């Protein structure tokens, strides 16, 4: 597994891959880890899809519930906060999973989640086995002057050599912009290709 | 019957409870709201009462959302109204949580109806002294429920509750047209209201929530209720 | 006796339980409905009652089933019918469970009256002020029983519910007549159900659900029910 | 005494249980039965009361099994008398988990009586309105045994219950005989019951269930009962 | 008092237990029996009364055994009594098992009291309506206790219980004698209660039983009870 | 109603509530007090009455702190006050640690709501005889609730509460101005209290406590008061 | 006060507890008893009852050994007193568990007087109609106390109890004296006793009990008391 | 009002509780006592009243230690009075236990009042009939607070309990002065008490326990009480 | 990790780094580790950064409720006590933690508080894989004779060669300074990189 999160002046940009490995075998390639849980907040998961798979849905719930009743989104150090707390809790009979979530409130913030509940801010992060083949490209290339459309291009180069070293990450890649503009927006499959051929990854 | 209106576990010798005739007492003290269905959609109405210019416009809204497809208005003791409430916006994520989506509306009102009839044949608990009317769109449709204090379930194509409830019933009950446009609906349902409004009063930018498939809902503003 | 109407866990001085004996007067102000047996088969009807326009024809129908090959019909309070059938609908559930098929109805009921005498002999709750027909096909074959507030349980080659209760079972305790045709026998249900109705009503697309072995149910529709 | 029939936990100034008293009025409501016992071996009977023709006669009959060596038979409520039949039906079930085989009908009724005395000291819950009757085979051989409301056991060669309690055990106490023939006890029997009956009256195909040593219970149908 | 009469957890302002002295009225009307010791041994006698001959003789004897080692008899409320007696077989289990033999009598009649206390100081339950006397052999030696609905023990070197107890005691405060034959006790008892009977009644077959030293208890035969 | 102003669970042949009627009746006995909003803050003040000199000065104070950003202020049974104030204060330290900061405060309010409606709906306990007042600042900005002792929520730009209630309301929803400076508001409000209080009275050293965006609360001394 | 003498739990309008105060009733219609101390050493005395010679004498007597080196007397409801006793005797070997050696009196009579206010402040539960006297030896030296119903503790260096008790404490209060030999406090105390005794009554063979430290209690014979 | 002066939790139509008010008045039957800070330190004393020379002179006194640098004394219901100074006796350690020391003395005198509002708000519960004094050192200094039966907590200068409790305050709010010595302030607080005194009656030794910072309490003995 | 406290006349000062390990390689560099709980009170850890957080917040709140309630500071004796208890109740599903408490009442106070529940008071502590490396330069430059810049320039000396020779030690350097007239005070990061390069560790 590959996710990818990092953060710029006024917008953040997540993305992963789709491979999912049951069985010691690539049972399936077009596997989702990348959720929309709020208006301006999304999260992606890495490691056993279960128990994964349900957290997205109480923290949906959770958020759901919130804007509802006081009627307005609840900050990105909250929701981390509340996911530390509910992972802490069962640290011994515990999920095992390894989370980022992503959002804006008054300003862009990342937060990477540990099974054991610890929560660490950072401008950019990555999980699963191809985490480190990321970090050596950000290393390299992130600049926070960077624009969106430099971002993208980044995460992509940046996953694309993920899949050529992991053997656990491979898939089509999915995209995620957010702005207190136009709001969380997944990128159509058509501008990841077109950005492909572009940059000579194919 | 002064022997057999004490307890909400007693039936009288002629089969009834007064305990429970009466808790339908204390609703038809609340303001007046209704619902109504039409092409591809369904809305409601509250009969707002102006108040004091002391109180923050935001919060006397009686149009509560359970989720951005199911709404919800309400009529008697407030202080339970608000419990209830927040009891179907529990409900409500208990099946997203179970099921992964909200796919029907009556697998909700159902838990609720169920939590009202418990406090009915067991002594030591009072009843909620209100009831509600539910709306929004499912897998089926459109869609537009009730429920009474014992809870007691029905689905209409319109109704209201408050006061000047059988008043609307019987204007509306001649006058509703299944399949309409949505302002040509809403036109019509300002005036059953204003059949049981008295003589003495008017209509003070009442509360109105529409919806219509594929969509939200949209609380729109008194500016458009004026029109 | 007015000392002693006021507890279901009190006996008269002559032996008998107010309590029980006016819970069943909450049963004889609900609609009223039948069912018959016949040539491998048994069905049900309801006095279907006219209502608003604005009530959707989906949900008032008290005919409800419980499984493909078993259905009932409830009389009384409607907030405590909603529950019993959902009850039922579960009881029956934990049968397949747990023998992998729904092999006896009579294992179904029982589970039903043990549920309703339960408030009977405890302080602190009320009775079910309903009583309930079921019917349906097991491997014995087509069934019919009833059940009243306390538990009681008896099965008939038919039976009646609600208001004209009294008036039905006399009319049908004269012409009934076993092993009949469908229709045959829809005709005969109908006329004592017409039998006890006022003069000054009539019949209003009644409820009818039959069966027949190694089939399901049908819920044919009122266009069939004018004929 | 007005003051003091009103709860099951209160003595009066006398010593008594006007509660307890009570529930033995409910009992004389029920139909009758006995039961005798003869030359290795003992039956019982019932005072069928005809009904409807609507009503399937094979499941008004009174007659209850317990085991393929036990039966019984009861008077009074209805309700009641179907839970602690079934409360009988699993308690000897528990003897032949724990001891292998139903060794003694004894060790049965008593887990019987002990849990409607139960209902007897403690507040909150009536009593049960039922007696009954239970016979069968055990190592010993030939039993009969009787209980009341509140866990009176006796044993006896010859019993009645019912309405006609009194009348029977009174012709009972004159002309029973030990160590009889089967049929010859019969006929004596049903003559003692056709006392207590009203001359008004007569008899209407009574249940009749025998048995004898090394073999099952017999429950001979209405032809043999004509004679 | 009628208002202090309701309830057992009320004293009354003369510091009172009217329910408390109204159980002891039900013992009052149960038949009559007594225990005495003598010469290295003790025994009872209970005022057996004639019933109906078709009840078997071995279950109307009031004479039960707890161990072969320890006796009792009761009076009162017959179906609390089966209860204790059934306590009692149990509480004497319990002591072989935690100390490998019942060593003594009082470690027994002191669970029950305390069984029988603990009814009297908490509501919503009733006292028991029985005493009962006790006799056997422990460590010690021959012993007789009783003990009162509410727990009381005393232990006595005679005593009576039933109807014609103060008849009895009058009589046997008089002409008592320690340290006597088997035989000239009882013939001393049997006079006893001939006084308390009434002049028109006689004695019945009444049951009898004692035991000496190093054996165990002997129910000898009507036969022998005419001598 | 004598016959329906005994138990919070019974609801009156008119829909009422008189025990919860009642306990607004101990309400009025308390002090008076007022909150205001204005220009990026919000304030509180309460109507201090002097007392014997024998009393610290440091406890009398009614304006208590939930948090360094919320206060509140209560009227009524001065024992439950001090008890909801804690479970104020340990509301808010449970979502810090949820939610990492106490980003709302309806979610408060409500956490306490919930804790007095739950004294309203069931027996065998009295609900709280208090309302109170909330305010301070979140990331939404100034508010400023209302809490009755049933639940009923509400969120005002200003309200009062005490004896004087009315009377401070009335003036206040005249001469009441929004987004005003800090002392302009201030001298408006002890204006509004002087109107509720009687001739016979004046001022005597009343708490203030205001606070401001990006800052904490202030309790400024009686010095600054006289002014 | 008829409205206030129902409930332990109720106060009157003058402060009080009427059901408290008549169990003070019940204990004085126990026999008389007190207690005195001396010089290194305590005792006890009874004023024992003449009974029936048919009771064994080894029982009657009311002095009560806790262990070795404490005892006790009480009066009032003896059922109650056998409890209270029993509850004594297995608090003390709680603190020999704890402790190692019961070190202190006032360790234990707490322990009990708790378990007496517990009854005084729950409803559904009658108090204790006994009070008691203890005696005995501990680190300190000769103790003496005494508990009512409600759990009152007083330490004396003389007592008395049952209904010569204020004939006694006036006699006592005058000639008591500190410091005395043993049996020239024993003349004394029987003289006190013998002052509360109606003259138409003697005494008969009390009982007593003393202890003195280094030693543990001596219950010497009728024999010697007649001196 | 009889009507509303039977339970704690039922509130008068004038919003009061009888019950509560009730309590109150078994407070001003117990003897009188004060407290009065001071320069440095705080002191407290008790009406002692003569008693029979047959009583220890060591446990009528009513100043009680909670540790070495808390006391407190109490009036009322002498046997619930043992209980709170044990409950607070153990309050006190579990700060100890938690926090290494008792740093404050709020955190102590909280934990009683919750646990005495605690008996006023649920049914089946008597509150409790008394009010204490509570004094000692913490890091803060001399402190010196107060509770009634509901809880309510007030920190005072100087203060009352008993009978001639307004008395007392009537004087003491007229002569009392800060920053006093020791002795100067004594003298000062037997004269407030000797005002309250009835003419017929003087002082009798009365009970006095000082404390100053830096040092532990001091319980001088009636010697100095003289002077 | 690496945190050291230190105690002067009436001054008290704390200082840690940020690094931070997950996963067995540097996922975050600019973590926190340093809080403040109390007006006059700070707070130091190591160890599992989930079981570390959720004490932090339950600190919070439980001194924040005293203050308000009794409107006073609780002191520091009492702190370190009831973290002592809440720790010993789990002694065997617990806290994998080691803590410092570091405060200001009538004088200044340190306590070294372990995952078991004991507590120590000293003139100076530390915690982390990076500890004894600062032990040895306390135990030859530390003298209770010094000022509050003299103890400030310590504590960069000492944690700078725990990032020597410490490999799960590093980043900046986050100070904190107490004292009953200026409360507990964060120090510029200004302010720090300047008494590096006049002290010469760049």
Known sequence: TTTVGITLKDAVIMATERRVTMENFIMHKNGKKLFQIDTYTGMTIAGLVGDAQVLVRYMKAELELYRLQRRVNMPIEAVATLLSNMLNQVKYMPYMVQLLVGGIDTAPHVFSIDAAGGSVEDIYASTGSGSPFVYGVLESQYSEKMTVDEGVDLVIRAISAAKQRDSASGGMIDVAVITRKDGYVQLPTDQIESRIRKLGLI | ?227
Do not use: H, W
Request: charged letters at 25%; a neutral charge; glycine letters at 8%.
């Open chain 2, 1 to 227: 019957q002064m022997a057999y209106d004490r307890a909400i576990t007693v039936f009288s010798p002629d089969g009834r409870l007064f305990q429970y005739e009466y808790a339908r007492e204390a609703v038809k003290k609340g303001s007046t709201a209704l619902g109504m269905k039409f092409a591809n959609g369904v809305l409601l109405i509250s009969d707002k009462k102006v108040r004091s210019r002391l109180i923050e416009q935001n919060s006397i809204e009686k149009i509560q959302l359970i989720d951005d497809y199911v709404a919800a208005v309400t009529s008697g003791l407030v202080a339970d109204a608000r419990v209830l409430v927040d009891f179907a916006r529990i409900s409500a994520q208990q099946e997203k949580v179970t099921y992964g989506s909200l796919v029907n509306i009556e697998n909700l009102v159902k838990r609720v109806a169920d939590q009202m009839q418990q406090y009915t044949q067991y002594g030591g608990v009072r009843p909620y002294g209100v009831s509600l009317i539910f709306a929004g769109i499912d897998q089926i449709g459109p869609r537009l429920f009730d429920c009474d204090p014992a809870g007691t379930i029905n689905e209409y194509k319109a109704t209201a509750i408050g006061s000047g409830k059988d008043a609307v019933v019987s204007f509306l009950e001649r006058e509703y047209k299944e399949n309409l446009p949505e302002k040509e609906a809403v036109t019509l349902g300002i005036k059953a209201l204003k059949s049981s409004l008295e003589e003495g009063e008017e209509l003070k930018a009442p509360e109105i929530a529409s919806i219509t498939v594929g969509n939200k809902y949209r609380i729109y503003d008194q500016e458009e209720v004026k029109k």
